[PDB]
Amino acid sequence: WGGFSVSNPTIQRFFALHYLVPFIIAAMVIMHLMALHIHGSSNPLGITGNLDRIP
Amino acid sequence: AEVTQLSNGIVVATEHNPSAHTASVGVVFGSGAANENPYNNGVSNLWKNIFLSKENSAVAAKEGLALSSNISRDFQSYIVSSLPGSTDKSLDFLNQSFIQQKANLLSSSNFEATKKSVLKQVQDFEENDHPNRVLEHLHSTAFQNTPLSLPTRGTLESLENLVVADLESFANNHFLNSNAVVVGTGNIKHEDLVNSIESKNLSLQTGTKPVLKKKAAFLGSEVRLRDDTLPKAWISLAVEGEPVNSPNYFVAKLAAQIFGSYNAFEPASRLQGIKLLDNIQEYQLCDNFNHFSLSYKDSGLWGFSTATRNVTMIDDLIHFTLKQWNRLTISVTDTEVERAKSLLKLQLGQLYESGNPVNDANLLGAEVLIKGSKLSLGEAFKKIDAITVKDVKAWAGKRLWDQDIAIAGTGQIEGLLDYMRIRSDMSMMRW
Numbered sequence: 065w066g067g068f069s070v071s072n073p074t075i076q077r078f079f080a081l082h083y084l085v086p087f088i089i090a091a092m093v094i095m096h097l098m099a100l101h102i103h104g105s106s107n108p109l110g111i112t113g114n115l116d117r118i119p
Numbered sequence: 120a121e122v123t124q125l126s127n128g129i130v131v132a133t134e135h136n137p138s139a140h141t142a143s144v145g146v147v148f149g150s151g152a153a154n155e156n157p158y159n160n161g162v163s164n165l166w167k168n169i170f171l172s173k174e175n176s177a178v179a180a181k182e183g184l185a186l187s188s189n190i191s192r193d194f195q196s197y198i199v200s201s202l203p204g205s206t207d208k209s210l211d212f213l214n215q216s217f218i219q220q221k222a223n224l225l226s227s228s229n230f231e232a233t234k235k236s237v238l239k240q241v242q243d244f245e246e247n248d249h250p251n252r253v254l255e256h257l258h259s260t261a262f263q264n265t266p267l268s269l270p271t272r273g274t275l276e277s278l279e280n281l282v283v284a285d286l287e288s289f290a291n292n293h294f295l296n297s298n299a300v301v302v303g304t305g306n307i308k309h310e311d312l313v314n315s316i317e318s319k320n321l322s323l324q325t326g327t328k329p330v331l332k333k334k335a336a337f338l339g340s341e342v343r344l345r346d347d348t349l350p351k352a353w354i355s356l357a358v359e360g361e362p363v364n365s366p367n368y369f370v371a372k373l374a375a376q377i378f379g380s381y382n383a384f385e386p387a388s389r390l391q392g393i394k395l396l397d398n399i400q401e402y403q404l405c406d407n408f409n410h411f412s413l414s415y416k417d418s419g420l421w422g423f424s425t426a427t428r429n430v431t432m433i434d435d436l437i438h439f440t441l442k443q444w445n446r447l448t449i450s451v452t453d454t455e456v457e458r459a460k461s462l463l464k465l466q467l468g469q470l471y472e473s474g475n476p477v478n479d480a481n482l483l484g485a486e487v488l489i490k491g492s493k494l495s496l497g498e499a500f501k502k503i504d505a506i507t508v509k510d511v512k513a514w515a516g517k518r519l520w521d522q523d524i525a526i527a528g529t530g531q532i533e534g535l536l537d538y539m540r541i542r543s544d545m546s547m548m549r550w
C-alpha cells in the first residue's frame with residue numbers, strides 16, 4: 065500500500081509497475097519463442113512432423 | 120556445303136561431304152515418342168532394339184555395314200553406315216530389313232529376347248541414370264496428360280504388355296510414305312542416291328499417320344522423387360520454351376547460352392564469363408549445371424538441370440539462378456550478348472559440322488521432316504548476328520518474367536523448398 069489503505073502511493077506505484085511489467089512479458093515472449101524454436105511446433109495428429117514440412 | 124532435296128512421295132535429302140571417308144544412308148521417320156498412347160509406350164524403343172537385334176546386326180556386319188538408330192520425341196531414325204563404295208549394298212539391306220519383310224525380324228525368339236533386353240535396359244535406366252530420369256520426369260510433368268509427356272525410353276509397366284501385334288500396328292500406322300525421309304549423309308552424291316532409289320522401288324506404304332487429338336500445352340507443376348539413400352540432389356527446372364519454326368528460336372538458344380554450362384571440378388570451367396559464378400563458387404553450391412533450350416514440334420522447354428552435394432543450400436542455388444534469370448528481362452548487358460553469340464556460333468558449328476555422319480543424318484532428317492528444308496549454317500550465323508539486347512529483353516519479358524515453371528527432382532531434395540517460393544522468385548519485386 066505504501067501507507068495504511070489504498071491511497072495515492074498505491075495508485076502511483078501501480079501505474080509504475082503496470083508500465084513496467086509488459087516489457088518483462090515481451091522478454092518472456094522472446095524466451096518462449098526460443099524454447100519453441102529448439103523443437104518446432106506440434107501438429108494436430110500427435111505424430112512427428114519432420115517428414116512433410118512447409119516453410 | 121549444300122543440302123539438296125527431292126521428292127517422289129519419299130523425300131531424299133543429302134549432304135555430299137567429299138572429304139569424309141564413310142557414307143551414312145538411312146530412313147528418318149516423322150513419328151517419335153510423342154505419337155504413342157500411354158499404353159503402348161516404348162514401342163519405338165522396341166523397334167530400335169529389334170532393328171539393332173543380334174541376327175539383323177550379324178547380317179548387316181557380313182557386308183561391312185554398321186547399324187544405328189535413334190528414338191526422339193518427334194523423329195525416329197534407322198541409319199546404315201558403310202564405306203562410300205557400298206551405298207547400293209546399304210540401300211538393299213535397308214530395303215530387305217524394313218520393306219521387303221518384317222516377319223523374320225518379328226519371330227518369336229527374336230522378339231522375346233529383345234523384349235527381355237529392353238526391359239533390362241529400362242530398369243537399368245530407371246534405377247541408375249539419375250540426371251536423365253530427372254529430365255524425363257521434367258518432361259512428364261511439364262506436359263502432363265498430353266502426348267509430349269511420354270518418355271522415349273518407355274515405362275516398365277507398359278513395356279511388359281507389348282506383343283507383336285502392337286509392333287505391327289505401330290508399323291502400319293507410322294512407317295509410312297509421307298511420314299518418312301530417306302537420308303544420305305557423308306561421302307555420297309545426291310544424284311547417285313536418287314538414281315539408286317529409282318533403280319529399286321523402295322515404296323514403304325500408302326501413307327497418312329494418325330493425327331493427335333490433343334496439342335501440346337505447357338502446365339506448371341512439380342514432381343519430387345525424394346530418395347534419401349542417394350549421395351546427391353539432381354534437379355531440373357524449366358519454363359515453356361520455344362518450339363521449332365518460331366522466330367524466337369535462336370533467341371531462346373542464346374538466352375540459354377548466356378548462362379551456359381558449368382563443372383565445378385574443371386579449372387577452366389570455373390573461370391567463365393558468367394556473373395552467376397561469383398555467387399555460386401563462394402560456398403560451393405553445386406557441382407555442375409547446364410542451361411538447355413529444348414525445342415519440339417509443338418512446344419519447347421527452357422531451363423536448367425543441375426546436381427549438387429551441398430544439400431542444405433539447394434534453395435540458395437535456385438535463388439541465385441533465378442535472380443540471374445530475372446536479369447535477362449531488366450538489365451542484360453551488351454558484353455553478355457556478344458559472348459553468348461560467339462559461344463553459340465561455336466557450339467552450333469560443332470553440332471552441325473562435326474565429323475560423324477550419323478549425327479548429321481539424324482539432324483538433317485529431323486529438320487527436313489519438320490520444316491521441309493534444312494537451314495544451312497551461314498544463314499544461321501546471320502540470324503545469330505541479327506540478335507540485339509532488345510530482342511533478348513522482349514523474349515525474356517514474354518517467356519521468363521513471372522511465368523509458370525516446371526520442377527523435377529530426385530535424391531536428397533528436402534532442402535528444396537515449396538513450389539510457391541520458387542514460383543515467386545521468378546519476379547524480383549524490385550523492378
Ligand code: HEC
Nearest residue numbers: 089090092093094096097099100101103104105106107108
Ligand atoms: C501456458 C501456456 C501458454 C501461454 C500462456 C502462452 N503460450 Fe505460446 N505456446 C504455448 C505452447 C504449448 C505452444 C506450443 C504449441 C504446440 O503445442 O505445438 C506455444 C506456441 C507459441 C507460439 C508459436 C505459434 C503457435 O501457435 O504455437 C507463439 C507465437 C506463442 N506461443 C506466443 C505466445 C505468446 C505471444 C504468448 C503470450 C504473450 C503465449 N504464447 C502464451 C503455450 C503457451
